Amino acid sequence: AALTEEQIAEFKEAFSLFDKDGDGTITTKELGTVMRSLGQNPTEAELQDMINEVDADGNGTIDFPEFLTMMARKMKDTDSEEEIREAFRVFDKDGNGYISAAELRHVMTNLGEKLTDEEVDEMIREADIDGDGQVNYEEFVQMMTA
Amino acid sequence: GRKLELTKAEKHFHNFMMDTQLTKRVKNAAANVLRETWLIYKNTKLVKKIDHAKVRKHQRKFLQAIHQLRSVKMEQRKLNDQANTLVDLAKTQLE
Ligand SMILES: O=C1Nc2c(ccc(Cl)c2Cl)/C1=N/O
Ligand SMILES: [Ca+2]
Ligand SMILES: [Ca+2]
């Protein structure tokens, strides 16, 4: 809950991601816009509640002082290994901890934003550690988060 | 840099009650948990004569207050993650 000066200048650049018009305040309308471009759908009440958690003065919008201030209350990070492993489990049909290279290529080239077959090649080169056409994704995720 | 780390989620009720409406929701539902826990205890353990219809009334009121409380807790969990999403997007400007 008290961090460095370099980050102050950094969080200012972050602020423009949020202040969609550049008027120096973040409104619920702009926060809805940003949140929807991240694939979320907060309600109007959820947007008002996020602003009100930050809003120091009570004028209904967030300025950079209030923005920077709540950043410091939330500076700690934690590793993501277990969340990434569960994303892999979604594609583990048998629940046996494996996903074949063929199944992984099919997923990466058909679901979400996709990868090129060339990009997928490099990924499987790394993911199939034992060269047996099967990806032990817990091992693969530990290698990527180490 | 951060690589694949993300903002660490918080711990307990110690936030987002600045929305007095959740606060009004928490305080009323928790009083009703107290209310129906007492009335079920009394109507099953402090009487010679268990009036099952009375216990049914308060079991329905009890499950109602508990799930209201559950419902507030899940909306707090959702608000925190919506906030951690913004903190996470902001934090990519440190890279
Ligand atoms: O309670 C919180 N409200 C928050 C948090 C973190 C970031 C932001 Cl923008 C808001 Cl409005 C919170 N972390 O606990
Ligand atoms: Ca604005
Ligand atoms: Ca303000």
Residue numbers in the entry:
A (entry chain R): 2 to 147
B (entry chain B): 395 to 489
Paste lines from the article.
Small conductance Ca2+-activated K+ (SK) channels are a unique group of ion channels that are activated exclusively by intracellular Ca2+ levels. The Ca2+-binding protein calmodulin (CaM) is constitutively associated with SK channels and Ca2+-binding by CaM activates these channels. The Ca2+-sensor CaM associates with a channel CaM-binding domain (CaMBD), which is located within the channel C-terminus. Ca2+ binding to CaM induces conformational changes in both CaM and the channel CaMBD; these subsequently trigger opening of the channel pore.
But, substituting a phenylalanine for hydrophobic V407 dramatically enhanced SK2-a channel Ca2+ sensitivity by almost six-fold, from 0.30 ± 0.016 μM (n = 8) to 0.051 ± 0.0024 μM (n = 8, P < 0.0001). And, NS309 (6,7-dichloro-1H-indole-2,3-dione 3-oxime) increases Ca2+ sensitivity of SK channels with a higher potency. IDF conformation is flexible and, thus, invisible in the apo-crystal structure, whereas the drug NS309 stabilizes IDF, resulting in a well-defined conformation in the crystal structure. Similarly, in the V407F mutant structure, the electron density of the IDF was further improved by NS309. The newly identified V407F substitution stabilizes K405 in MD simulations, reminiscent of the impact of the small molecule NS309 on SK channel IDF conformation.
